[model samples]
Target: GSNFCDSKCKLRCSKAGLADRCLKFCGICCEECKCVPSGTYGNKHECPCYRDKKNSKGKSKCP
Candidate 1:
């Protein structure tokens, strides 16, 4: 799929201490939504992928 995280998102995820768990998923969502907040856990509404992403258990996937 074309959805993937760019360097910007990767850097932010690393800074937010989510690189170990959320990096891959966050990248996927960011690539698809084309939007990622400046910080860790806010502005999800700005990106539909971050706001609407679901995990295998049907819960929020974005960190």
Candidate 2:
């Protein structure tokens, strides 16, 4: 999987089913590209949506 983000992150979810399309996408992108979390809520478990905006002004990757 490529880490292009294409343009922006997209997701699909279900009530209890494993709607993991976005998480897998995000995980692949994050692993390949050099990016920091956009905010405290930017991760596959939460916001799943991430942009490739430069992290020049953002803090280091969270723990």
Candidate 3:
């Protein structure tokens, strides 16, 4: 990533309803995807890695 995952996740996790969990998943996803979307909320289209991930249960894998 152009910036580190920690910094990206910090801002990305800021507005989550469950921030600690948000940070946790954001860290994992960003590490794999090498990007976090630009804002704390939606705008997932900006980052395909952030947008296209999914869990086994078919939910979004990233916050």
Candidate 4:
């Protein structure tokens, strides 16, 4: 029960239309995308984000 995620969670975005775009693209193309966890020790891509030391500081863009 300790590891459970809260249901009333939300993510913040700097851009105004990014969330709408993400949702539209996903809905239109059936693309599967994931969000980076906001918790202290969260998993990305089903892999422990902190455990993977290869996560570097860089910029990635969606084409």
Candidate 5:
């Protein structure tokens, strides 16, 4: 499995303006899973960790 975040994913995340909350986790997930949506939002289906991630209250917490 790849251990680096893809350029597309980095770009999308950077443009999403969610660095404070999504950057670190996004990097971790993207690097580990090697799967990130082409654009921002609405494509969690491509990665289980991206889709199934939740906060303490069971809320969606992935970018």
Candidate 6:
């Protein structure tokens, strides 16, 4: 599952300008939650744990 996290997060962060931040935060989410959405954007509904965890500032916890 951790390996899965590493690979998929790469794809998830593929198009990000801030790809380093994207991959790091995305890995954090998948570490705790176990999944990420499909593609580079707009598929958060494909992953509830990835989508539902908001930070204290109400910002999205995952990229």
Q: Please, what is the TM-score per model?
A: 0.64, 0.29, 0.87, 0.23, 0.61, 0.91
Order of candidates by lDDT, top first? 6, 3, 1, 5, 2, 4
Model 1 per-residue lDDT tens digits across residues 11-63: 55866654766677777777667777666667776767668878799998766
- Residue 30 lDDT (model 5): 68
lDDT of 6 by residue, 1-63 (tens): 549999999999999999999999999999999999999987999999999988999888898
Itemize residue pairs with steric clashes in candidate 5. none
lDDT of each: 0.69, 0.38, 0.89, 0.29, 0.67, 0.92
**In model 2, which regions exceed 4 Å deviation?**
1-18, 36-63
Error of 6 at 45 (Å): 0.9
Point to the candidate with the largest TM-score: 6
In model 6, which regions exceed 4 Å deviation? none
Model 4, range 1-63, lDDT digits (tens) per residue?
A: 221122112232223256555334323222223333343223333423322323136532221
Q: If both were scored by lDDT, which would come out higher, candidate 1 or candidate 6?
A: 6
Stretches of model 3 off by over 4 angstroms after superposition: 1-3
Prediction RMSDs, each to the true structure: 3.9, 10.3, 2.3, 9.5, 3.3, 1.8
At residue 39, what lDDT does model 1 achieve? Answer: 65
Distance from true location, Cα of 62 in model 4, Å:
7.8
lDDT, candidate 2, equals: 0.38
Per-residue alpha-carbon lDDT of candidate 3 for residues 1-63, written as tens digits (9 for 90 to 100): 466899989999887899999999999899889888988888888889889999999999998
Alpha-carbon runs more than 4 Å astray in model 4:
1-17, 31-63
Q: How accurate is candidate 5 locally (lDDT)?
A: 0.67
Candidate 5 at 12: error in angstroms? 2.5
At residue 6, what lDDT does model 2 achieve? 30
Residue 62 local lDDT, model 3: 92
